[PDB]
Design a binder for this molecule. Structure first.
Ligand SMILES: O=S(=O)(Nc1nc(O)c(Cc2ccc(Br)cc2)s1)c1cccc2ccccc12
Length: 358
């Protein structure tokens, strides 16, 4: 019953191979998507290093230039790009064709990412730094790396909106298993906590009855107990708030997907829904308040290796290994019908309508 309506809208936005990208460069080491505004690809054509910027508002006109960099990340919003070569980092203003700032690190930066409109996080083998793109400031060390992530491939770093909670995520091969290792750091406490996790995100959520938003930490893991997802408030509730009761739910994997595991998460600011993507190209939806699983489906035939928030729909946008650029968001008009008649969870249907963010 109601087999035809879905709680999500799937969209294809682009096929990068149709825009002249070599499929060999459609991967984590050469293609970045730091927000839904831009895709940046490093390509070696003949002997020439080139960097291609796809403006998602004008994608059929990619800009391609000879630029030598080990890594290239567009600003989430501005026409500004961070470039790295060896231990030397530069931030460049594209629109004004001008160098903004440069810095030479002592240690190699193995992973970097824009964490805000104006700040780029730098991960080295032993520490994490934040670097403002503005003014004269140098990178500032935020914390030292926990031994539990030693030797990991770093896969993500992110913060809460207030930049008081910092999360570093790595994976390692333990025999034939991919084991996720996170470090959660409290700026104010100066304390780290090691956490077995594969994908996470922070979120701000206003509980019924509270005047102030709660800062939530959501992570998903496939460990020895199977797939689990946790939704936890970090630190102490804002003055006047009740605390958010911790939620813990299973994360399902079908029998034919024993080697699947979580790889990405984004949280809808408008809908209070967690989007979880797996290595095999499945998407899951969970309610942020309860952890309730809303929907699961395989949405991509290829691994989706990078994601970002999709701002226009308060959804998730990603790029798969073949170059499909795809998004998923809540279908606002069919979500409650689906919850009512397919999930048959009227409490969730009621709570979503009472939030009234549809
Ligand atoms: O749009 S650009 O400004 N194109 C450029 N092409 C060349 O050749 C540039 C050369 C240049 C060297 C030194 C300075 Br200072 C300024 C520009 S800048 C640009 C700058 C930085 C990174 C880019 C990556 C992909 C596409 C264009 C890029």
């Amino acid at each position: 019953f109601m087999a035809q309506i879905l709680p999500i809208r799937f969209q294809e936005h682009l096929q990068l191979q149709n825009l002249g990208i070599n499929p060999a460069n459609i991967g984590f080491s050469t293609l970045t998507m730091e927000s839904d505004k831009f895709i940046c690809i490093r390509e070696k054509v003949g002997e020439q290093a080139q960097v291609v910027i796809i403006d998602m508002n004008d994608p059929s006109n990619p800009i391609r230039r000879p630029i030598s960099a080990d890594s290239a990340i567009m600003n989430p919003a501005s026409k500004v790009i961070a470039l790295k070569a060896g231990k030397t980092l530069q931030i460049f203003n594209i629109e004004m064709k001008s160098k903004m700032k440069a810095h030479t690190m002592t240690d190699d930066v193995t992973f970097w990412k824009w964490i805000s409109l104006n700040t780029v996080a730098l991960v080295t083998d032993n520490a994490v730094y934040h670097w403002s793109m503005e003014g004269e400031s140098q990178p500032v060390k935020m914390f030292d790396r926990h031994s539990s992530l030693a030797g990991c491939q770093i896969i993500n770093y992110r913060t809460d909106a207030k930049q008081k909670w910092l999360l570093l995520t790595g994976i390692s091969a333990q025999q034939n298993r991919v084991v996720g290792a996170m470090q959660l750091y409290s700026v104010d406490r100066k304390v780290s906590q090691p956490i077995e996790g594969h994908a996470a995100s922070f979120a701000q959520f206003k509980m019924e009855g509270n005047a102030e938003e709660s800062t939530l930490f959501c992570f998903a893991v496939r460990g020895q107990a199977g797939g689990k997802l946790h939704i936890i408030e970090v630190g102490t509730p804002p003055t006047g708030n009740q605390p958010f009761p911790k939620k813990a739910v299973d994360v399902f994997f079908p029998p034919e997907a024993q080697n699947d595991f979580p790889v990405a998460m984004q949280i809808s600011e408008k809908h209070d829904v967690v989007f979880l993507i797996t290595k095999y190209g499945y998407i899951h939806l969970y309610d942020l308040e309860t952890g309730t699983c809303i929907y699961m489906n395989r949405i991509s035939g290829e691994t989706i290796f990078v994601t970002a928030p999709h701002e226009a729909t308060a959804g998730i946008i990603g790029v798969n290994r073949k170059g499909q650029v795809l998004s998923v968001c809540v279908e606002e008009e069919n979500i409650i019908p689906y919850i009512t008649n397919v999930l048959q969870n009227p409490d969730l249907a009621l709570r979503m309508a009472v939030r009234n963010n549809l």
